[PDB]
Every structure is written in structure tokens, then in C-alpha cells.
Amino acid sequence: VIHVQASFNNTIVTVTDVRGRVVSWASAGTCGFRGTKRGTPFAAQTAAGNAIRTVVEQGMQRAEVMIKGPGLGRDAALRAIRRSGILLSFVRDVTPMPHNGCRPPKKRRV
Template identity: 50%
Template sequence: MAKAPVKAKKKAKKVVSEGIAHIQATFNNTIITITDNQGNALSWATSGGSGFRGSRKSTPFAAQVAAERAGTAAKEFGMQSLHVNVKGPGPGREAAVRALNAVGFNIHTITDVTPM
């Protein structure tokens, strides 16, 4: 006798309306991680992972592309508004925040959390 095929249950997609965008801008790369309010990562992107290599990773345009990629992935979770934490002295700080705004997020606060 043949066994009946086992149906896998569909995993319910997480719906999050508000989250936190962590932007780490170093002199060599920019890392954007978007989390829920508890700190669980929903999406992330880097300048290097977006196809930029060498000195082009540290440009504001590379940070903009990475922020757009992370933002569109977070939009799939139903996210609409963000609190932004920016860390580091890199050139991609402002470009990443502007790109998240351009994706369509309502940005509540922008906080500089660079350690001193």
C-alpha cells in the first residue's frame, strides 16, 4: 500500500507594523538591519552584498541601494513606520536614511547611537 502524501502546514507570515532600522556606517561598508520592536531581525542588507566591491562599498550610493533592498524586504512584513538608529562615522549614514524614507516608511525618530 502506498502512503498518503503528508501535507506541510503553511507557516503564518509575521505581520509587523512598526520596527527599528539599525544603520551601521563604517568607512569601508554600510550594514542595514531592520528589526521588530523586540529586536528580532526581519531583513538586512549590506553595501558589499548589493554588488559593490572595493572602495565603491563605502560610497553613499552603495548605502542607498542597500537600504532600498532591506526596506523592500521589510515592506513584505507589512511594516509601515520605523525608528532609525545610526551608528558609525561612515559616508553612507544620511543616504541610507533618505533611501528608507523614499521606500515609503514613516520615520518617527532618528537617533545617533555611535559609542563615544
């Protein structure tokens, strides 16, 4: 399984088995980016490549991607995962869905 978390400030990529035990991970920050460059779609490509490249070597051709949240790199990360030597079954997005649960913050003025 390949959990990916998209956002405007960073994109995280954690790999794990079906049982939920991580084997490796890497984000835009670990790759070398910092600040606003992390949220760019290009950083998601390079961040996804470094995390999955070690996994393709250790067998496990099967994979499932779990997208979580918005961002510019969520679509670019698919090109990184697709541009690889692995198949995949699910392309589902495990996003939260609050039914008017809590109070969000106030709107920004600037």
C-alpha cells in the same frame, strides 16, 4: 527598527523589531559592491533599498532608524529610507561614547 552602521569601508543595514529579533538585512557587499566602492554613498542607497523594500511589503509602516558611526552613506541612506512608503518617529544615532576607556591604535605614518 532599522539599525544602520556607517563606516568608510562598508555600510550595514539590519532590520529588527523593537524586541531585537532581526527579520532581514543587506549591506553594500551583499548588493554586489566590493573593495572601496562599498563605502561610497551610492552603495548605501541601493543597499538600504533592497533591505527595506521587502519590509514595506510585510506591513509595519512604523519604523525607527538607529545610526551608528560615521561615513558618507549615513546621509545618503536617509534619502533611501525617506524615499519610501513608511513613516518614522526616531532619527536617533546610537553611537558609542567611551570616557577614556581603552588605548586606541597608533597613528598611521603614510
